Write a protein that binds this ligand. Structure first.
Ligand code: HEC
Ligand code: HEC
Ligand code: HEC
Ligand code: HEC
Ligand code: HEC
Length: 142
C-alpha cells in the first residue's frame, strides 16, 4: 500500500522493487520494506528535480549521504563477514556502483571468483585513466 503512491507515476516494473528487497522485512518496524525506506519522501517540488528523495549512483548526493541510508538497516560488522572489501568502500564509493537492487537479481550475488576480482581492476583502472571519475556515480559495471 505505501508504495502505491509512488507507483502512481513511476513504472511498476523497472521502478518497482523486484530484487531481494521486494520480499524482506524492515528490521526497524517489522513491516515490509517500502520505497521511502531507501528514498525518503517527495516534496511538493518533486517533479522539478530537487533534493527531496535520495538518488543512488547519481551525482546529486555525496557517497556518504547515499551509503548512510543503507546503514539505517545494514550492519557494517556483518558486511565484513560477507565480503571483506565492504569497509574500505563504505565512505569511498556508492554502494550502488556495484549492487543493482531493482532488477530481479543483483549481479554481485552471482559473480564468478574471477569476476569478483575483475570488478576491482575495472574500477580502480578507470580511476587512473578517467578524468571525469566520480565515486558518487559510476556507470562502469552497469
Ligand atoms: C508524480 C505525481 C510522482 C509521484 C507521486 C512520485 N514521483 Fe518520483 N519522480 C517523478 C518525476 C517527474 C521525477 C523526475 C524528476 C527529475 O529529477 O527531473 C521523479 C524522480 C524520482 C526519483 C529520481 C530518479 C532518478 O533519476 O534516480 C526517485 C528516486 C523518485 N522519484 C522516487 C519516488 C518515491 C520514493 C515516491 C513515493 C514516496 C515518488 N517518487 C512519487 C514523479 C513522481
Ligand atoms: C531496510 C529498510 C533496508 C534498507 C534501507 C536497505 N536494506 Fe538491504 N536488505 C534488507 C534486508 C532485510 C535484506 C535481507 C537479508 C536476508 O535476511 O537475507 C537485505 C538484503 C540486501 C542485499 C542482498 C540482496 C540479494 O540479492 O541477495 C544487498 C546486496 C543489500 N541488501 C544491499 C543494500 C543496499 C546497497 C542498500 C542501500 C542502497 C540497502 N540494502 C538498504 C534491508 C534493507
Ligand atoms: C563492489 C566493490 C561492492 C561494493 C562497492 C559494495 N558491495 Fe556489497 N557485496 C559485494 C559482493 C561481490 C557481495 C557478494 C559476496 C558474496 O557472498 O558472494 C556483496 C554482498 C553484500 C550483501 C549481502 C551479504 C550477505 O549476508 O549475503 C549486502 C547486504 C551488501 N553487500 C551491502 C552493501 C552495502 C550497504 C554497500 C555500501 C556501503 C555495499 N554492499 C557496497 C560487492 C560490493
Ligand atoms: C533499497 C532497498 C530500495 C528500495 C526499497 C527502493 N529503491 Fe529505488 N533505488 C535503489 C537503488 C540502489 C537504485 C539505483 C538502481 C538500482 O536498481 O540499484 C534505485 C533507483 C531508483 C530509481 C531511478 C533508477 C531508474 O529506474 O533509472 C527510481 C525512480 C526509484 N528507485 C524508485 C523507487 C520506487 C518507486 C520504489 C518503491 C517501489 C523504490 N525505488 C524502492 C534503492 C531502493
Ligand atoms: C568503483 C565501482 C570501485 C570498485 C569496483 C572497487 N573499488 Fe576500491 N575504491 C574505490 C574508490 C573510489 C577508492 C578510493 C580511491 C582509491 O582508489 O584508493 C577505493 C579504495 C580502495 C582501497 C583503499 C583502502 C584504504 O587505503 O583505506 C582498497 C583496499 C580497495 N579499494 C580495494 C578494492 C577491492 C578489493 C575491490 C574489489 C573486490 C575494489 N576495491 C573495487 C572504488 C571502487
Amino acid at each position: 500500500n505505501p508504495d502505491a503512491a509512488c507507483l502512481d507515476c513511476h513504472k511498476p516494473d523497472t521502478e518497482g522493487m523486484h530484487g531481494k528487497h521486494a520480499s524482506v522485512i524492515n528490521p526497524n518496524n517489522k513491516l515490509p520494506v517500502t520505497c521511502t525506506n531507501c528514498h525518503g519522501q517527495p516534496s511538493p517540488q518533486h517533479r522539478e528535480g530537487v533534493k527531496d528523495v535520495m538518488r543512488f549512483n547519481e551525482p546529486m548526493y555525496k557517497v556518504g549521504e547515499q551509503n548512510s541510508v543503507c546503514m539505517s538497516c545494514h550492519l557494517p560488522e556483518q558486511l565484513q563477514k560477507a565480503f571483506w572489501p565492504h569497509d574500505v568502500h563504505v565512505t569511498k564509493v556508492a554502494c550502488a556502483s556495484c549492487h543493482s537492487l531493482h532488477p530481479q537479481q543483483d549481479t554481485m550475488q552471482t559473480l564468478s571468483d574471477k569476476g569478483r576480482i575483475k570488478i576491482c581492476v575495472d574500477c580502480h583502472s578507470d580511476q587512473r585513466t578517467n578524468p571525469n571519475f566520480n565515486p558518487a556515480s559510476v556507470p562502469l559495471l552497469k
